[PDB]
Design a protein around this ligand. Structure first.
Ligand SMILES: [Mg+2]
Ligand SMILES: [Mg+2]
Ligand SMILES: [Mg+2]
Ligand SMILES: [Mg+2]
Ligand SMILES: [Mg+2]
Ligand SMILES: [Mg+2]
Ligand SMILES: [Mg+2]
Ligand SMILES: [Mg+2]
Ligand SMILES: [Mg+2]
Ligand SMILES: [Mg+2]
Ligand SMILES: [Mg+2]
Ligand SMILES: [Mg+2]
Ligand SMILES: [Mg+2]
Ligand SMILES: [Mg+2]
Ligand SMILES: [Mg+2]
Ligand SMILES: [Mg+2]
Ligand SMILES: [Mg+2]
Ligand SMILES: [Mg+2]
Ligand SMILES: [Mg+2]
Ligand SMILES: [Mg+2]
Ligand SMILES: [Mg+2]
Ligand SMILES: [Mg+2]
Ligand SMILES: [Mg+2]
Ligand SMILES: [Mg+2]
Ligand SMILES: [Mg+2]
Ligand SMILES: [Mg+2]
Ligand SMILES: [Mg+2]
Ligand SMILES: [Mg+2]
Ligand SMILES: [Mg+2]
Ligand SMILES: [Mg+2]
Ligand SMILES: [Mg+2]
Ligand SMILES: [Mg+2]
Ligand SMILES: [Mg+2]
Ligand SMILES: [Mg+2]
Ligand SMILES: [Mg+2]
Ligand SMILES: [Mg+2]
Ligand SMILES: [Mg+2]
Ligand SMILES: [Mg+2]
Ligand SMILES: [Mg+2]
Ligand SMILES: [Mg+2]
Ligand SMILES: [Mg+2]
Ligand SMILES: [Mg+2]
Ligand SMILES: [Mg+2]
Ligand SMILES: [Mg+2]
Ligand SMILES: [Mg+2]
Ligand SMILES: [Mg+2]
Ligand SMILES: [Mg+2]
Ligand SMILES: [Mg+2]
Ligand SMILES: [Mg+2]
Ligand SMILES: [Mg+2]
Ligand SMILES: [Mg+2]
Ligand SMILES: [Mg+2]
Length: 153
RNA sequence: GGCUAAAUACCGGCACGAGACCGAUAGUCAACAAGUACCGUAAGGGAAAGUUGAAAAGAACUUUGAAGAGAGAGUUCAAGAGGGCGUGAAACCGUUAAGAGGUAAACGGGUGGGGUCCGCGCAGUCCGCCCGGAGGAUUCAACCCGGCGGCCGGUCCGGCC
RNA sequence: GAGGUCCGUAGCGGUCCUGACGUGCGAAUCGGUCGUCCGACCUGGGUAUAGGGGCGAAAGACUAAUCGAACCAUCUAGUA
RNA sequence: UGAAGCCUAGGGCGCGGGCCCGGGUGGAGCCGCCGCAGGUGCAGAUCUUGGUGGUAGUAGCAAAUAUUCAAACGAGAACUUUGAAGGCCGAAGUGGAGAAGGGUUCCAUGUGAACAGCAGUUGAACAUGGGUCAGUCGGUCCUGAGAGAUGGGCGAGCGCC
RNA sequence: UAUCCGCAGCAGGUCUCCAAGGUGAACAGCCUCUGGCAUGUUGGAACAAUGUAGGUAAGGGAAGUCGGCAAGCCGGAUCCG
RNA sequence: UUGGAUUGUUCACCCACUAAUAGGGAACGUGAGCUGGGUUUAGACCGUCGUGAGACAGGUUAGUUUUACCCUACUGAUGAU
RNA sequence: GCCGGAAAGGGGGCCGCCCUCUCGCCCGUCACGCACCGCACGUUCGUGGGGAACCUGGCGCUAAACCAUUCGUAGACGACC
C-alpha cells in the first residue's frame, strides 16, 4: 500500500507485504537482517537450511540470554539460533514475492532482496495467574513484514 | 367550638423558551443496546464506549497461497479516507542516509571542520543640482475670460448666538 | 466379653523436620513423620442467637479471606 | 486559487515570556486592535486517567512411574482416530450411579478468526439443528425443632409482644 | 486432578450407595481381572556446578550441635522370661 | 597458635596435647550465606509491686528468618582491535 | 665486481666500464626573461600516507579457514584433542 522506501526503478522491482502475523517480532527481525542482501535462490536455500538447523541466524540486537553455537563463526558472531516459524513465514512471503515478479514479467533468477523491514503490530492480550491471587498480562508480539526485490546482475 | 380566596413556596412531574455555561479524561454516573455490562450472600457498588465518504460508489476481474494475507486492476477529488475507516502529536520501534565512538551519557564558553538549505550572489548602489552633445513636443513667462479657495474692510452692509 | 481401655485402618486433626514452596499448585498448599480412632465421637440438611450485640471446655477466640467492637450508605469535601 | 491543527538540517525578530515568514500534510473555519469576563499558563504532589519502554525473547512452561510402531483422513500429525505392543488406576478406584450446586455444558453436523499458557484435522470453543413423556419415582399431604396471623395488650408511629 | 466454590481446565474444598482374585489377622501395603486412562497447561538433545527427593560408605561411634535436630537401631508370629 | 567438659554466650574455668597454645581490625567483618540457643510482639506459670487494669536490666517454657533474571565486583567460557 | 651491517641488520666507501665537459666553483665582460603596473596563504620534505579504479608490458602462482561429519585425552553451550 504505502511502502517505507520506494524502489529506485518501479519496473525492475517487485513488492510483497504481510500484516498481523503471529510470529515473534524479535526473531523475525533478525531473520530478515540475515537475509537482507541475498539473491533469491541463495536466500531460499539458506532459509531451508535454517529450518533444518543446518545454518544459524545470528542474534545481534536481541541477543540477551541467547546461547552460543559453532555456526555463527561464519557470520563473525557468537550467538545464533534457528527460528523455524520465523523462517517459514517469510519463506511463504518470498514465494509470494517471486510469484508477483513473475506476474509482472520479470527475470526470477536475477532477483536480489533490496529492501526488507519488520515492524511491530498491535498486541493481543491473554492472562496468566500468579501467586497470591494476582493477574498479569500474557501479551503477544505480532509483526508486519515488508519486502522489495529487484533485478541486478 | 368551627369555616375561609389573594398576595407566598416548588432541585419531583407534563410541556415549553433561553444562556458572556461544558464541548467526549469536560458536561449528569449515563451524547452510544446506561443505572447497561460487570463484582458482592445481601444492603448496595457500577464502568469503558462519538466522527469513512457528498453519495457505498464498501474494491468486480486476473494472479500466488489451505487461509489469513499480498501483487496488479478499479471507485472516489482524496484509499496519503479500505468497515474501531476525519485530522494523526509525544514516549517507544523498523529501515534509509550522514557523522562519530577505550574514561556512561548529556551540558556551558570559544573556535574549527563537514553537511542541508538560503542569498535566486557571481563583475555590483543610487538620488538631487549643474556643464557639454545629440534628440523629441503645441511649450515657458507675460496678458485675457470663467470657476473655486484663503485672508482682510482702521469703523462696508446684513444676520445669528 | 466390661472399659470416656491399648496397637492400628477409614474418618477427624495438625507435632517435628523450624523439610518443600515462598512474584507458589495455593491470599495457608505439599511430602515424610505424627495425635486420636465406641465416644466429652465425626458429619449433611433444617432451625435459633446480630454488632457495644451474639456465641465462646476462655486463645480477646469466631461472627462470609474483615474483629481489643463486622459490613453498607449517609451526616461528610468531618477536624488537623 | 485552501482556515484551524500537526511536522520541519529552511529565513528571521525579541534580554525573555514568545512571535512572524518559507516548505510539507491537512480539508472549513480563523485572526489583529479598543474595552469586558474568567473553571486562564505545570516537572514534580508514593498526583488522576490512558499509553509505551529497559528488564527480556529473560524467569519460567519439573507434585502423582511411560511410552513405541504402522495405517487412515488431512495442505499440513510428538499430540486426532483405528490396530498392535508395553504400562498405570487396582473394587476405601483414575470404575458404575445420585444429593447440593451449575443451566444446555447433553447429542449430531460443520468451522478452524479468537480461546483451550506448545500444537491441533481435536474441544465443556464458535455456528447450525435436535433432545427431558409417569395414577403406582419425587413434590404436592403430615408434623418436628421453630416460624406466624386474628382476639388482647403495648406503642408518637411504621408497628411490636 | 476439566461441567460445583476458590478471578482459572487452580496439587485446596465439597454429602452418600455398589465393591472381584492372590498374599496376608485384615476394607493395611504389593501384583492381577471387569471397567477406565494416557502421565496431568508442551516436546527434543545432553548428564557441568548449585539444588529437590532418594541410597550406600572403610576405621571410630555424638568427639558434631544450644540441644542425638536429622537419619539410623527395633519391628510380625510361636516358645520361654 | 589445637582437640574437648560446663555455659546462648562474648568472657570465664578446667582436662589433654603442644613448639606455642600471642593480642587485635575489617559498619562491635560476615542473616537476599546459614542457625535461631539469648534478647526482641502476640499464649501461659512463679516471686515481688499495685485496690485494680497491669509492671519488673527477676526466673521459666512455646513461638512464620521473604525476593536475584538487573548493574558492578569475582570465578570460569567464547570472542574482539 | 670488492667489501661496510643483527639490540629494532648498512641506498655507504672502493676497483674496473663503452661514453661524454671543459659545462658545474670564485672573480670579471655581455645582454636576455611575462618589467603582469605597492598588497595574503609564496618557497619544500613529496613520485608523502591511504582508497578506488583506467593501463601497457615482463616474471611468475594456482591456497586455505570455517560450517557439516567423525573422535572423547575435552565438555553446561561455545571452546578443545
Ligand atoms: Mg543487547
Ligand atoms: Mg544475564
Ligand atoms: Mg501460575
Ligand atoms: Mg485464588
Ligand atoms: Mg368564641
Ligand atoms: Mg376563634
Ligand atoms: Mg428573553
Ligand atoms: Mg472521551
Ligand atoms: Mg463522561
Ligand atoms: Mg476518546
Ligand atoms: Mg478529543
Ligand atoms: Mg478522551
Ligand atoms: Mg476517531
Ligand atoms: Mg485528504
Ligand atoms: Mg483523510
Ligand atoms: Mg486515520
Ligand atoms: Mg527514524
Ligand atoms: Mg551508519
Ligand atoms: Mg480408646
Ligand atoms: Mg489409642
Ligand atoms: Mg502449630
Ligand atoms: Mg519451613
Ligand atoms: Mg525459591
Ligand atoms: Mg440483647
Ligand atoms: Mg468448643
Ligand atoms: Mg470502638
Ligand atoms: Mg467535511
Ligand atoms: Mg469558562
Ligand atoms: Mg496541561
Ligand atoms: Mg506532565
Ligand atoms: Mg527460548
Ligand atoms: Mg529459559
Ligand atoms: Mg504440574
Ligand atoms: Mg465415580
Ligand atoms: Mg458415568
Ligand atoms: Mg460433546
Ligand atoms: Mg495455544
Ligand atoms: Mg409476631
Ligand atoms: Mg513423568
Ligand atoms: Mg503427555
Ligand atoms: Mg488437569
Ligand atoms: Mg561408617
Ligand atoms: Mg563398619
Ligand atoms: Mg558435646
Ligand atoms: Mg564443640
Ligand atoms: Mg527424630
Ligand atoms: Mg557485626
Ligand atoms: Mg550480607
Ligand atoms: Mg535473612
Ligand atoms: Mg527462641
Ligand atoms: Mg511472651
Ligand atoms: Mg537461565
Amino acid at each position: 500500500v504505502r511502502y517505507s522506501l520506494d524502489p529506485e526503478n518501479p519496473t525492475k522491482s517487485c513488492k510483497s507485504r504481510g500484516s498481523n502475523l503471529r510470529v515473534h517480532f524479535k526473531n523475525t527481525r533478525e531473520t530478515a537482517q540475515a537475509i537482507k542482501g541475498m539473491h533469491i535462490r541463495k536466500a531460499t536455500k539458506y532459509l531451508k537450511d535454517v529450518t533444518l538447523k543446518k545454518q544459524c541466524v545470528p542474534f545481534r540486537r536481541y541477543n540477551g540470554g541467547v546461547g552460543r553455537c559453532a555456526q555463527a563463526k561464519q557470520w563473525g558472531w557468537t550467538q545464533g539460533r534457528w527460528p523455524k516459524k520465523s523462517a517459514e513465514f517469510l519463506l511463504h512471503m518470498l514465494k509470494n514475492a517471486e510469484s508477483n515478479a513473475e506476474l509482472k514479467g520479470l527475470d526470477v533468477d536475477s532477483l536480489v532482496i533490496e529492501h526488507i523491514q519488520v515492524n511491530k503490530a498491535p498486541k493481543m492480550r491473554r492472562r496468566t495467574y500468579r501467586a497470591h491471587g494476582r493477574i498479569n498480562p500474557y501479551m503477544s508480539s505480532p509483526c508486519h513484514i515488508e519486502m522489495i526485490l529487484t533485478e541486478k546482475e
